[PDB]
Amino acid sequence: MSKFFIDRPIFAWVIALVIMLAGGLSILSLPVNQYPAIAPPAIAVQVSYPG
Amino acid sequence: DVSSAIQAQNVQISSGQLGGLPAVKGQQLNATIIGKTRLQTAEQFENILL
């Protein structure tokens, strides 16, 4: 709840900045791609037999 | 001798193609060759030459 923070603004600023730079360094450690694993899993067996 | 004759006369044989690669320059025909296949009925088995 509030009323603990309007008298204590530095606590609120610290919470804001720590969630900011908790996400901002974590963006540099996860990969980026176009799409997630949308395709179903599939296993293929394969042989070749000449002639 | 019976086992060797069966192993000789009941086989699948890879016999390739007519116009297989690398073909000669100008070839226009290509078809798979169906060589020896396995026997199916008992009458094909009982005509095996010993």
Q: Which amino acid is located at A14 in the chain?
A: V
| Number of neighbouring beta carbons within 10 Å of residue B22 | 6
Q: Tell me which DSSP letter residue B45 carries.
A: H
Question: How far apart are the C-alpha atoms of A20 and A29, rounded to whole Å?
Answer: 15
Q: Which amino acid is located at A4 in the chain?
A: F
* B16 touching chain A per CB within 8 A: yes
Question: How far apart are the C-alpha atoms of A8 and A32, rounded to whole Å?
Answer: 39
- CB-based contact A49 B15, cutoff 8 Å: no
Question: How far apart are the C-alpha atoms of B49 and B39, rounded to whole Å?
Answer: 13
Q: What is the DSSP string of A1-51?
A: --SSSSS-HHHHHHHHHHHHHHHTTGGGGS---SS-S-SPP----------
* 3-class secondary structure, B6: helix
Residue B17 sits at φ, ψ, to 5 deg, of: -135, 165
* 3-class secondary structure, B5: helix
How many Cβ pairs within 8 Å bridge chains A and B? 5
Structure solved using which method?
cryo-EM
